[PDB]
């Protein structure tokens, strides 16, 4: 595997940064009253690594013995939805937002089943089985109410760890029942130290300047920094101080899209950007990320007073994008309105 | 069963005893007469709320087919086969059409 | 003077008569030919008397979309190779005791009558030598009265001596079913092959049809061959759509206009009326507005936006296929046209976000363009939905969205046309802004009359397949995050594959090809080549 | 096996609920007559409503009969009211026997505690009214809400209404200090005061945060940092930085401050809450306060719908910066 | 001994007595004359003519063999998985002597009420027994019918009846019953029946049974909807930005007890045919749709309708 999957820490003493937080997570399991966790923060800060560390500290080493199961669940409209689940002998892991508006359904029955699983399985190790709900911030209001009901019902038999990146969408009834674990992103020095630690295990000696460039260009994303270090290791055997960091392909695609938006403001260019955003969306890139990158590069090419108007317009159409079922409509609404505003601004 | 309302009154808050405002906006209350037009007095004409017209079409519809599709002659049949083969150059027309002719 | 449906009148009696899925047809025909050879060798051994290398599994499984031809291919192959099909449908009570005690002896015992009219293939119900062959049709359909049916077909795996064929349309049935069987996948056939097939069956009925109308019908019903055959039978036997002679060489009349009949647009429009001419011309009359609202309402019941999906052709703007007072009047036309287009797109965003849809989108899976949705199967029980639903909202929201979309389109089209008649002054000035007012459309959206989707769904499905096949390797299978996987792991994988391809094309060491083997990644080589091409 | 300190340290009996005088008095005179009327407790969260109704249940019933003959449902069920109607119908039809060894017989009725009753729409409230007027003698209801005005007139007319006032911060600090002395955790009075402040009068959230901090710290002292990051509250330094970036008039440093807040894991709804608390309690003009608070409400609504934190926060900070630099 | 309703007394007995949906009804007519009808599914709004056209087509195909060659099943019948497996298959395997080109017909009315399991169990029955038996299904929501069943049937879309066709059938009924009428009453009846001929005939018969004269007072007394004159005056006051008189009309409608859904539906129906400019009509329909989305989402009050009226006035007061 890669260094993002092979050199990942498994124990709570192996976590290089957030040592005080890792120590508090170590004493969290010693009391035996391990509650539901709400592990939130930016992407790639070290969230899932810390969940795996807590799961290893809770049970034995058998949590690393992983497998994949498929479960078919019947909706109340008499339809069947099949979902995937990472599983072990002691824990569970599912992305319940994969079932759309029926997420509540795979919220209910699945935890019901695993509760019955802990009613059947006996090993005298731990009283509960931990289920990892990934992307709780993508759950609908009905799904989150069903989650509140399920956590209140099956608390004694199973435990829940909610891994999200945004607690804003998470309803206050959910947040009032789980212990909050904020995992902020590692700093530049933390990313450089982790990169040097990982690169030393391969017998390679990267310089501090290349590590600082990788830390700066990753926007405090440890997974992205490690994977860019993997790409740099693939590109060259020695690590020069001026080694070129390979940029992300869809990122430069979005950059070219925004230069296409800025350069020409015509209906033909609007349809060209329409094709470009369609081809970006066919690659399963989320429209929020497309909107964020587009807004960043348009604010690169905007004026002083126009930045606030463009940002408010982008936030407006991103909220409308979250409201509508077809996000492409709101993407091109933002693009066309920005083109009109830009053409009006450059005319005087 | 008898009902009761319990509000633990605190005299120091001074919001329990509230008097009507003395400002002229909330003193002079505007009056709405609640008078509406009678509904069988005006009347509705044809096509007022629909797409109705006084003129109705006649002879432009109810055309029965009564079609007699003549059998296609051989030369026209191969001409149409060549047209379909030009439309789809990668299709195997010669190995399907005689078999469907046998199927008919 | 005919009493047969066109599906069974034009049923393929030979395996070469089926359209598409040639690899699956060849695999099934080879499997059944090997079984027939084993049966004939068994007969020869009986005449004489009185298996890892072969690897001939006792059972095939066939999966694909609905109406693609799984049962038709099975019947054609069994007819060609002389098998006798014993069919078990969901249309008869098939519980374990009955199916075992009434059809095990077909596999385990000889046929008492081996010659004659026994090539006819019967069914199963309980209220030259011909080899027996079981066909479980629609195995995914399991009822409560079919108790122990899965255990019974497992016993049929274990203790058969004659072949078993399973037909299913559920894509995930082969996951939950435990056993040994040869898997056969039926893919959706291409548009043009089925279009030429339908043109062939129409030309046998002495009709001339164009390819584009059949392509619109087939992309409307998603290449369901049986559905298109049956609707073709209904439409041809009722007299066709519209008398229009099209002289083409590439003589009888042509009969274009079947797709509009399929969507029910001919119950609204007059026969003299044309949909494209109706949308292009300026509407003023009340009856014309009623017709437009009814047309748009008929398209909103399907949750398909008609005008925006075909935006370039229906607009009064130039469309190309992909391969100072004068200055103020050149700029004002483009500025007004962009303003009206932006207003229309804002209107469509308003209708998509702040207006109710009649069908609640992302109900069982998430939004479009996602490989994480899974499979949604229809109901297998005899119980009703029993949930509260609002019929008045579904009745009124379609008309509301249709009226608002029609008014938005008419405002936008009038604004762009009242911008466009002043382009003659710019043309007289020697400057051509029409290169900026044009629309560049793809060939996929140009070979059809009207489209129900403005995106490349084939490219989307190819990207979905490559995303699934990347993250189904055993090393990447335990990655917790999914959109973060395709946003962080996948671009680095594409860059690694590009660098590996550049190293291979530079005549470097062959150990660099084993870099994925050096880190022990299990990505298939076709997927490694696909990631190494580009990021389009 | 251990229970949370919210459940463990709620009062066992009626008149142990402090700072509620009249509600406890009428509940006592209902206990004396052994008949509990329909109840409607409204007040701020964490003020002793569930504690009072449960204490009335445990002292009217037996300790072993308390959990069997009451039913606590949550009225914000996402499957409509008919599912809750099914639970109330099943619990009213189901009957269990009761016998107390203390010499007092059990009442013939039963207790249904409908929590967050204010979240039910008026149609669902009218649907529930049929159930409570069709099972009046054999079943009594207690609706727990925070706003009595959200409960419709046919319900509120037939219920007995009680208002729960919040305890003062001194009383909350005293109860938290008693809890910490009971559970043997080293914590000064300043940390308890900051806990009561950061809970905003919510004793339930204060006890939850205290128990969670004792679990997290591993037997050390409870610092201010662990209380701050266990409550999800942004420190005031970041709020002052946001306001300084808004008053400066530079959009680039505004983006830098917002991206710094996003990188630290802090929520956007919490930032909107802190910004609203700062704005409405300062020396801004009424027009500035009006525009800023309207934009804050719009941004909060957009964040509740699931919109991205970064874009909404950037738009709100642009509005606040424009309104603050309008005086320039 | 009772008066039969005009929906049954004047029910069509042939396929040329059916107004509206001219193309599909004509195709059914040529199939009834020629024979060999395929398995059909007829989808459309209520009151369109689906059951009538299916029954008339079956009658014209069969003739005297109706009592033995036709099997009809409504939603009041069982139509379960076991019914599909025994009764449907037994009728399909049943021998019935018919002229060549004519088959036995299984009519499944209200196919939305069929369970998904029964539709899955009826898939092969629609296929093998197609040389002796045909299936004619009628449905309102075609999405309730599963895709494998829709693959084996030709789906024919019925659209709402245009008001001219309803007017022609209404004058046919009036001239055959000597009912005095006015054009006011005919327009009122046509407005009350939104493309529903069954509703139009029921409204006409109820009006004649109640008062015997067809005028808008009697018609809207019989139906008791929000009167389109009040809604027209309210929309006209919103056009003139007269928020007080428009709210007077709206509060009068609210105190009359009409539901918010009925009020917003009547508002949309009147504003669809209202005489105003194109852009103003577009903003009016946009605000009506946004308010109706709010009504459907759960928030419905006089505050929401007053906010809609204020937004409509703001559309006039703002360029
Ligand atoms: N590839 C094909 N070539 C020719 N005819 C076809 C083809 N596919 C379908 N048909 C026709 O459609 C009829 C029914 O198709 P089936 O094979 O029963 O569909 P299916 O693959 O079994 O999918 P199901 O069973 O409906 S889920 C056949 O009898 C043929 O007349
Ligand atoms: N007046 C009071 N007397 C005694 N304990 C109190 C009082 N007010 C609050 N508490 C304590 O505060 C905690 C929470 O109060 P509860 O009554 O259980 O919940 P709550 O007041 O209903 O808040 P909700 O349910 O979220 S609306 C419990 O530990 C109670 O013991
Ligand atoms: N197109 C029509 N032409 C003439 N009368 C019609 C027409 N449609 C409906 N009617 C009348 O309305 C009555 C009931 O209509 P039906 O056709 O039986 O209902 P339907 O069209 O099947 O709609 P649903 O979905 O079953 S409610 C008929 O008996 C006729 O009197
Ligand atoms: N303390 C640490 N020391 C070394 N490597 C780490 C540490 N924390 C995280 N990593 C590496 O960074 C990656 C973190 O990704 P992950 O936490 O799964 O993303 P997310 O936070 O979005 O779930 C892991 O692949 C792991 O190898
Ligand atoms: Mg089949
Ligand atoms: Mg409570
Ligand atoms: Mg009917």
Q: Check CB contact of C269 with chain B, cutoff 8 Å.
A: no
According to CATH, what is the number of the domain E162-225? 1.10.8.60
Question: Which atom of ligand 4 lies at the shortest distance from residue A6's CA?
Answer: 27
Of D100, D82, D98, nearest to D90 by C-alpha is D82
Contact yes or no, E with C (3+ CB pairs under 8 Å) = yes
How far apart, in Å, do the first and last CA atoms of chain C sit? Answer: 56
* Burial class of residue D223, CB neighbours in 10 A (0-12, 13-18, 19+): middle
Q: Check CB contact of D163 with chain B, cutoff 8 Å.
A: yes
Q: Taking CB atoms and an 8 Å cut-off, how many pairs form between chains A and C?
A: 242
Q: In terms of domains, do A57 and A173 share one?
A: yes
Question: Which atom of ligand 1 lies at the shortest distance from residue E152's CA?
Answer: 26
Q: Check CB contact of A348 with chain C, cutoff 8 Å.
A: no
Contacts for E33 with CB less than 8 Å, ≥ 6 apart = E60
Which pair of tokens denotes residue C494? 């594409």
How is chain E split into domains, by residue range? 2-161, 162-225, 226-317
For residue A79, give how far its alpha carbon lies from the nearest alpha carbon of chain E (Å). 9
Map residue D322 onto helix, strand or coil: helix
Q: Is C257 annotated as a binding residue?
A: no
CB A249 within 8 A of CB C491: yes
* Burial class of residue C121, CB neighbours in 10 A (0-12, 13-18, 19+): middle
In a domain, A13, yes or no: no
In a domain, A10, yes or no: no
CA atoms lying within 13 Å on the CB side of residue A314:
30
Question: Measuring CA to CA, how many Å separate C107 from each of A63, C43, C179, C404, E151?
Answer: 46, 15, 18, 64, 32
Q: Is D44 annotated as a binding residue?
A: yes
Contacts for C261 with CB less than 8 Å, ≥ 6 apart = C235, C241, E23
In a domain, A139, yes or no: yes
Give the residue from A157, A182, A207 where a domain finishes: A182
Distance CA A54, CA A49 (A): 9
Long-range pairs, C54-59, Cβ under 8 A, ≥24: C56/C31, C57/C180, C57/C181, C57/C182, C58/C157, C58/C160, C58/C163, C58/C164, C58/C180, C59/C156, C59/C157, C59/C160, C59/C163, C59/C164, C59/C165, C59/C166, C59/C179, C59/C180, C59/C181, C59/C182
Q: In terms of domains, do A67 and A150 share one?
A: yes
Residue with tokens 């000597």: E178
Q: Taking CB atoms and an 8 Å cut-off, how many pairs form between chains A and D?
A: 134
- Helix D251-263 and helix D236-248: axis angle, to 10°? 160
For residue C526, give how far its alpha carbon lies from the nearest alpha carbon of chain A (Å). 18
Distance CA A270, CA C18 (A): 44
Residue with tokens 């001419």: C277
Fill in the DSSP letter of residue C486.
I
CB atoms within 10 A of CB C163: 25
Of C91, A186, A119, A237, nearest to E120 by C-alpha is C91
Q: Chains meeting E at 3+ CB pairs closer than 8 A?
A: A, B, C
Distance CA D235, CA D278 (A): 13
Please indicate the experimental technique that yielded this structure: cryo-EM
Q: In terms of domains, do A266 and A148 share one?
A: no
Q: What are phi and psi of A40, to 5 degrees?
A: -135, 155
Which pair of tokens denotes residue C432? 């051509």
Q: In terms of domains, do A168 and A258 share one?
A: no
Q: What are phi and psi of C266, to 5 degrees?
A: -85, -15
User: Beta strands A80-87 and C375-377: pairing type?
Assistant: antiparallel
> Which of E169, E183, E224, E253 should we substitute to test contact with B (largest number of B Cβ atoms within 10 Å)?
E183
Q: In terms of domains, do A24 and A126 share one?
A: yes
Q: Count of domains in chain A?
A: 2
CB A166 within 8 A of CB A137: yes
CB A321 within 8 A of CB A288: yes
Domain that holds residue A330: 249-347
Indicate if the alpha-carbon torsion angle A219, A223, A229, A230 is positive or negative: negative
Question: Which atom of ligand 3 lies at the shortest distance from residue E158's CA?
Answer: 21
Which pair of tokens denotes residue D71? 């039913």
Q: Check CB contact of C456 with chain A, cutoff 8 Å.
A: yes
Contacts of A42 in chain D (CB under 8 A): 262-263, 265
User: Beta strands D160-163 and E40-43: pairing type?
Assistant: unpaired
Contacts of C454 in chain A (CB under 8 A): 278
The answer to whether C231 contacts E103, with C-beta atoms less than 8 Å apart, is: no
D17 lines ligand 2 (CB under 6 A): yes
A15 lines ligand 4 (CB under 6 A): yes
Alpha-carbon dihedral angle through residues B73, B75, B77, B81, given to the nearest 10 degrees: 180
Ligand nearest to the CA of residue C74, numbered in listed order: 1
CB D209 within 8 A of CB D199: yes
Helix (H) or strand (E) holding D40: strand D39-42
Alpha-carbon dihedral angle through residues D179, D184, D187, D191, given to the nearest 10 degrees: -30
In a domain, A11, yes or no: no
Of E176, E109, E114, nearest to E136 by C-alpha is E109
The answer to whether D163 contacts B6, with C-beta atoms less than 8 Å apart, is: yes
Helix (H) or strand (E) holding C165: strand C164-168
CB atoms within 10 A of CB A219: 14
In a domain, A232, yes or no: no
Ligand 2 center to D151 CA (angstroms) = 21
Fill in the DSSP letter of residue B18.
-
Distance CA E214, CA E207 (A): 7
CB C480 within 8 A of CB C389: no
CATH code at position A119: 3.40.50.300
Furthest CA-CA distance within chain D: 79
Distance CA E226, CA E207 (A): 17
In a domain, A65, yes or no: yes
- Helix/strand/coil (H, E, C) string of chain E? CCCCCHHHHCCCCCCCCCCCCHHHHHHHHHHHHHCCCCCEEEECCCCCCHHHHHHHHHHHHHHHHHHHHEEEECCCCCCCHHHHHHHHHHHHHCCCCCCCCCCEEEEEECHHHCCHHHHHHCCCHHHHCCCCEEEEEEECCHHHCCHHHHHCCEEEECCCCCHHHHHHHHHHHHHCCCCCECHHHHHHHHHHCCCCHHHHHHHHHHHHHHCCCECHHHHHHHHCCCCHHHHHHHHHHHHCCCHHHHHHHHHHHHHCCCCHHHHHHHHHHHHHCCCCCHHHHHHHHHHHHHHHHHHHHCCCCHHHHHHHHHHHHHHHHCC
Q: In terms of domains, do A140 and A32 share one?
A: yes
**Beta-bridge partner residues of B5:** D161
Interface of A with C in 172-231 (CB under 8 A): 221, 223-224, 227-228, 230-231
Distance CA C528, CA C526 (A): 5
Give the residue from A156, A182, A208 where a domain finishes: A182
CB C377 within 8 A of CB A82: yes
Which pair of tokens denotes residue A272? 């060209």
Residue D34 region by backbone torsions, left for phi larger than 0, else alpha for psi between -120 and 50, else beta? left
CB D224 within 8 A of CB D23: no
C363-398 b/e with 16+ CB inside 10 Å = b?
bbbbbbbbbbbbbbbbbbbbeeeeeeeeeebbebbb
Question: Measuring CA to CA, how many Å separate A143 from each of C503, D77, D302?
Answer: 49, 10, 19
Distance CA C504, CA C508 (A): 6
CB A167 within 8 A of CB A135: no
Q: What are phi and psi of A286, to 5 degrees?
A: -65, 145
* Burial class of residue E161, CB neighbours in 10 A (0-12, 13-18, 19+): buried
CB E114 within 8 A of CB E142: no
Ligand nearest to the CA of residue C13, numbered in listed order: 1
Out of C331, C370, C495, name the one closest to residue A246 (CB): C495
Q: Does domain E226-317 have CATH number 3.30.565.10?
A: no
CB atoms within 10 A of CB A140: 19
Q: Check CB contact of C477 with chain A, cutoff 8 Å.
A: yes
Superfamily of domain E2-161: P-loop containing nucleotide triphosphate hydrolases (3.40.50.300)
The answer to whether A99 contacts C499, with C-beta atoms less than 8 Å apart, is: no
Q: In terms of domains, do A129 and A263 share one?
A: no
Of D149, D107, D106, D156, nearest to D129 by C-alpha is D156
Q: In terms of domains, do A176 and A262 share one?
A: no
Helix (H) or strand (E) holding C439: strand C439-441
Contacts of A78 in chain E (CB under 8 A): 115-116
- Helix/strand/coil (H, E, C) string of chain A? CCHHHHCCCCCCCCCCCCHHHHHHHHHHCCCCCCCCEEEECCCCCCHHHHHHHHHHHHCCHHHHCCEEEEEEEECCCCCEEEEEEEECCCEEEECHHHHHHHHHHHHHHHHHHHHHHHHHCCCCCCCCEEEEEECHHHCCHHHHHHHHHHHHHCCCCEEEEEEECCCCCCCHHHHCCCEEEECCCCCHHHHHHHHHHHHHCCCCCCCHHHHHHHHHHCCCCHHHHHHHHHHHHHHCCCCCCCCCCCCCHHHHHHHHHHHHHHHCCCHHHHHHHHHHHHHHHCCCCCHHHHHHHHHHHHHHCCCCCHHHHHHHHHHHHHHHHHHCCCHHHHHHHHHHHHHHHHHHHHCC
CB E45 within 8 A of CB E196: yes
For residue B74, give how far its alpha carbon lies from the nearest alpha carbon of chain C (Å). 11
CB atoms within 10 A of CB D40: 26
Ligand nearest to the CA of residue D44, numbered in listed order: 2
Contacts of D21 in chain B (CB under 8 A): 8
Question: Measuring CA to CA, how many Å separate E88 from each of C216, D234, E99, E179?
Answer: 35, 69, 22, 46
Give the residue from A148, A182, A216 where a domain finishes: A182
Residue with tokens 């309703």: E5
In a domain, A193, yes or no: no
> Which residue spans within D106-199 are E strands per DSSP?
111-115, 140-145, 160-163
Distance CA A48, CA C480 (A): 7
Residue nearest atom 4 in ligand 1 by C-alpha distance? C18
Of A229, A153, A158, nearest to A191 by C-alpha is A229
- Helix E228-239 and helix E243-255: axis angle, to 10°? 150
Q: What are phi and psi of A165, to 5 degrees?
A: -115, -10
Contacts for C293 with CB less than 8 Å, ≥ 6 apart = C399, C402, C403, C406, E272
Alpha-carbon dihedral angle through residues D165, D169, D174, D175, given to the nearest 10 degrees: 50
CB C210 within 8 A of CB C220: no
Question: Measuring CA to CA, how many Å separate A152 from each of A35, C518, D76?
Answer: 12, 48, 13
Ligand 4 center to C490 CA (angstroms) = 17
Q: Chains meeting B at 3+ CB pairs closer than 8 A?
A: C, D, E
CA atoms lying within 13 Å on the CB side of residue A220:
18
CB atoms within 10 A of CB C468: 12
Distance CA A227, CA A214 (A): 10
Contacts for B97 with CB less than 8 Å, ≥ 6 apart = B81, C200, C203, C204
């Amino acid at each position: 595997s890669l260094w993002v999957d092979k050199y990942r820490p498994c124990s709570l003493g192996r976590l290089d940064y957030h040592k005080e937080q890792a120590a508090q997570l170590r004493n969290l399991v010693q009391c035996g009253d391990f509650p539901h966790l709400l592990v939130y923060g930016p992407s790639g800060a070290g969230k899932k690594t810390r969940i795996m560390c807590i799961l290893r500290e809770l049970y034995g080493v058998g949590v690393e013995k992983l497998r994949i199961e498929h479960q078919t669940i019947t909706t109340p409209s008499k339809k069947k939805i099949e979902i995937s689940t990472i599983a072990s002998n002691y824990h569970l892991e599912v992305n319940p937002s994969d079932a759309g508006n029926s997420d509540r359904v795979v919220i209910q029955e699945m935890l019901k089943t695993v509760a019955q699983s802990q009613q059947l399985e006996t090993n005298s190790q731990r009283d509960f089985k931990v289920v990892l709900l990934t992307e709780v911030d993508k759950l609908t209001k009905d799904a989150q109410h069903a989650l509140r009901r399920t956590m209140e019902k099956y608390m004694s038999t199973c435990r829940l760890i909610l891994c999200c990146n945004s607690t804003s969408k998470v309803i206050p009834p959910i947040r009032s029942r789980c212990l909050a674990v904020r995992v902020p992103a590692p700093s530049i020095e933390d990313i450089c130290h982790v990169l040097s630690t990982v690169c030393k295990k391969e017998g390679l000696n990267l310089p501090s300047q290349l590590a600082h460039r990788l830390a700066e260009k990753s926007c405090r994303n440890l997974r992205k920094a490690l994977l860019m270090c993997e790409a740099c290791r693939v590109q060259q055997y020695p690590f020069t101080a001026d080694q070129e960091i390979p940029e992300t392909d869809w990122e430069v695609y979005l950059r070219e899209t925004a230069n296409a938006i800025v350069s020409q403001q015509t209906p033909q260019r609007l349809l060209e950007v329409r094709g470009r955003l369609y081809e970006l969306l066919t690659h399963c890139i989320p429209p929020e990320i497309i909107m964020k990158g587009l807004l960043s590069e348009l604010l690169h090419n905007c004026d002083g007073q126009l930045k606030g108007e463009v940002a408010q317009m982008a936030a407006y159409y991103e909220h409308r994008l979250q409201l509508g079922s077809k996000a492409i409509y709101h993407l091109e609404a933002f693009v066309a309105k920005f083109m009109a505003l830009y053409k009006k601004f450059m005319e005087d | 069963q008898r009902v009761v309302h319990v509000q633990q009154k605190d005299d120091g808050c001074c919001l329990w005893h509230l008097k009507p405002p003395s400002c002229p906006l909330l003193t002079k209350f505007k009056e709405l007469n609640t008078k509406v037009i009678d509904l069988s007095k005006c009347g509705i004409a044809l096509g007022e709320f629909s797409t109705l017209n006084s003129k109705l079409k006649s002879g432009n519809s109810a055309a029965v087919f009564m079609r007699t599709r003549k059998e296609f002659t051989e030369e026209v049949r191969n001409l149409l086969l060549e047209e379909i083969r030009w439309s789809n150059p990668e299709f195997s027309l010669k190995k399907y059409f005689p078999l469907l002719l046998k199927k008919q | 003077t005919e009493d047969m449906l066109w599906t069974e009148k034009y049923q393929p009696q030979t395996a070469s008569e089926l359209i598409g899925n040639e690899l699956a047809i060849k695999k099934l025909h080879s499997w059944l030919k090997d079984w027939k050879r084993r049966a004939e060798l068994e007969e020869r051994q009986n005449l004489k008397g009185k298996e890892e290398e072969s690897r001939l599994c006792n059972t095939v499984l066939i999966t694909g979309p609905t109406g693609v031809g799984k049962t038709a291919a099975v019947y054609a192959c069994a007819q060609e190779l002389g098998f006798k099909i014993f069919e078990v449908n969901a249309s008869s009570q098939r519980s374990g005791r009955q199916i075992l005690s009434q059809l095990k002896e077909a596999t385990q015992s000889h046929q008492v009558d081996k010659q004659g009219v026994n090539s006819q293939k019967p069914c199963f119900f309980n209220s030259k030598n011909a080899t027996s062959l079981i066909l479980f049709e629609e195995v995914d359909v399991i009822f409560d009265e079919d108790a122990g049916f899965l255990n019974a077909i497992k016993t049929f795996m274990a203790t058969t001596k004659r072949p078993v064929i399973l037909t299913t349309s559920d894509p995930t049935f082969s996951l939950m079913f435990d056993g040994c069987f040869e898997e056969i996948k039926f893919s959706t056939p291409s548009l043009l092959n089925v279009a030429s097939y339908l043109q062939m069956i129409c030309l046998t009925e002495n009709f001339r049809t164009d390819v584009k109308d059949f392509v619109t019908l087939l992309t409307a019903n998603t290449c369901d061959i049986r559905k298109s055959i049956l609707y073709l039978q209904f439409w041809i036997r009722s007299g066709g759509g519209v008398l229009e002679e099209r002289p083409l060489t590439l003589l009888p009349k042509c009969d274009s206009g079947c797709a509009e009949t399929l969507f029910g647009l001919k119950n609204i429009f007059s026969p003299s009326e044309d949909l494209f001419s109706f949308l292009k011309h300026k509407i003023t009359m009340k009856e014309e507005w009623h017709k437009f609202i009814q047309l748009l309402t008929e398209f909103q019941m399907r949750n398909v936006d008609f005008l925006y999906s075909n935006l370039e052709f229906i607009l009064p703007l130039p469309v190309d296929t992909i391969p100072t007072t004068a200055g103020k009047k050149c700029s004002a036309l483009v500025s007004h046209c962009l303003n009206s287009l932006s207003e229309f797109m804002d209107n469509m965003s308003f209708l998509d976000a702040l207006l109710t849809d009649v069908r609640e989108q992302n109900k069982y899976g998430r939004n479009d363009f996602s490989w994480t949705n899974g499979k949604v199967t229809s109901g297998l029980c005899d119980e009703f939905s029993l949930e509260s639903n609002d019929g008045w909202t579904s009745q009124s929201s379609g008309e509301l969205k249709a009226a608002a979309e029609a008014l938005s389109f008419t405002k936008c089209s009038s604004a762009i046309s009242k911008a466009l008649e002043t382009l003659n002054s710019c043309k007289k000035l020697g400057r051509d802004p029409t290169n900026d007012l044009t629309f560049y459309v793809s060939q996929k959206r140009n070979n059809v009359y009207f489209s129900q989707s403005a995106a490349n769904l084939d490219n989307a499905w190819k990207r979905i397949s490559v995303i699934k096949s990347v993250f189904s390797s055993r090393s990447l299978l335990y990655v917790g995050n999914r959109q973060a996987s395709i946003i962080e792991y996948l671009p680095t994988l594409r860059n690694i594959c590009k660098t590996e391809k550049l190293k291979e094309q530079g005549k470097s060491k062959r150990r660099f090809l084993h870099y994925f083997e050096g880190i022990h990644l299990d990505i298939p080589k076709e997927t490694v080549n696909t990631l190494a091409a580009d990021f389009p | 096996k251990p229970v949370p300190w919210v459940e463990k340290y709620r009062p066992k009996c009626v008149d142990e609920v402090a700072f509620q005088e009249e509600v406890v008095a009428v509940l006592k005179k209902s206990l004396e007559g052994a008949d509990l009327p329909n109840l409607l407790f409204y007040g701020p969260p964490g003020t002793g409503k569930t504690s009072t109704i449960l204490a009335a249940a445990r002292e009217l019933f037996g300790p072993e009969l308390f959990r069997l003959r009451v039913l606590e449902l949550n009225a914000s069920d996402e499957r409509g009211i008919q599912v809750v109607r099914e639970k109330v119908k099943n619990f009213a039809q189901l009957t269990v026997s009761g016998s107390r060894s203390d010499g007092k017989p059990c009442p013939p009725f039963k207790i249904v505690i409908l929590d967050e009753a204010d979240s039910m729409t008026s149609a669902a409230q009218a649907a529930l009214r049929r159930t409570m007027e069709k099972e009046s003698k054999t079943t009594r209801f207690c609706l727990i809400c925070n706003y009595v005005s959200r409960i419709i007139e046919p319900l509120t007319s037939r219920c007995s209404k009680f208002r729960f006032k919040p305890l003062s911060d001194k009383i909350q600090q005293q109860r938290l200090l008693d809890i910490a002395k009971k559970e043997n955790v080293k914590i000064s009075d300043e940390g308890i005061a900051y806990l009561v402040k950061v809970s905003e009068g919510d004793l339930r959230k204060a006890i939850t945060f205290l128990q969670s901090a004792t679990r997290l710290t591993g037997g050390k002292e409870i610092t201010e940092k662990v209380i701050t990051d266990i409550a999800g509250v942004i420190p005031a330094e970041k709020i002052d930085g946001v306001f300084a970036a808004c008053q400066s008039g530079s959009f680039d440093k505004l983006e830098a401050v917002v991206k710094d807040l996003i990188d630290e894991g802090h929520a956007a709804t919490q930032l909107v809450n802190q910004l609203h608390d700062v704005v409405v309690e300062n020396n801004l003009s009424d027009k500035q306060k009006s525009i800023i608070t309207e934009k804050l409400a719009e941004v909060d609504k957009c964040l509740a719908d699931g919109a991205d934190e970064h874009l909404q926060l950037i738009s709100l900070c642009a509005t606040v910066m424009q309104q603050l630099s309008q005086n320039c | 001994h009772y008066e039969l309703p005009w929906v049954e007394k004047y029910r069509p007995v042939k396929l040329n007595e059916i107004v509206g949906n001219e193309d599909t009804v004509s195709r059914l007519e040529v199939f009834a004359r020629e024979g060999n009808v395929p398995n059909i599914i007829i989808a459309g709004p209520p009151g369109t003519g689906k059951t009538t056209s299916i029954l008339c087509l079956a009658r014209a195909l069969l003739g005297p063999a109706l009592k033995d060659a036709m099997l009809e099943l409504n939603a009041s019948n069982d139509r379960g998985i076991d019914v599909v497996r025994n009764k449907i298959k037994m009728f399909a395997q049943q021998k019935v002597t018919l002229p060549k080109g004519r088959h036995k017909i299984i009519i499944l009315d209200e196919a939305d009420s069929m369970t998904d399991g029964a539709q899955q169990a009826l898939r092969r029955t629609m296929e093998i027994y197609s040389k002796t038996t045909r299936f004619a299904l009628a449905c309102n929501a075609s999405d309730k019918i599963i895709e494998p069943i829709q693959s084996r049937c030709a789906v024919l879309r019925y659209t709402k009846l245009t008001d001219a066709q309803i007017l022609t059938r209404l004058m046919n009924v009036i001239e055959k019953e000597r009912v005095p009428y006015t054009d006011d009453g005919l327009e009122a009846i046509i407005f009350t029946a939104q493309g529903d001929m069954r509703q139009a005939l029921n409204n006409l018969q109820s009006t004649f049974s109640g008062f015997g004269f067809i005028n808008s007072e009697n018609v809207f007394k019989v139906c008791d909807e929000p009167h389109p004159l009040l809604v027209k005056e309210m929309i006209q006051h919103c056009v003139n930005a007269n928020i007080d008189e428009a709210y007077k009309i709206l509060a009068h409608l609210w105190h009359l007890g009409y539901s918010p859904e009925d009020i917003i539906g009547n508002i949309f129906r009147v504003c669809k045919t209202f005489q105003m400019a194109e852009y103003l009509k577009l903003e009016f329909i946009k605000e009506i749709g946004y308010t109706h989305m709010k009504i459907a989402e759960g928030v419905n009050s006089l505050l929401q309708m007053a906010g809609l009226l204020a937004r409509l006035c703001q559309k006039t007061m703002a360029p």
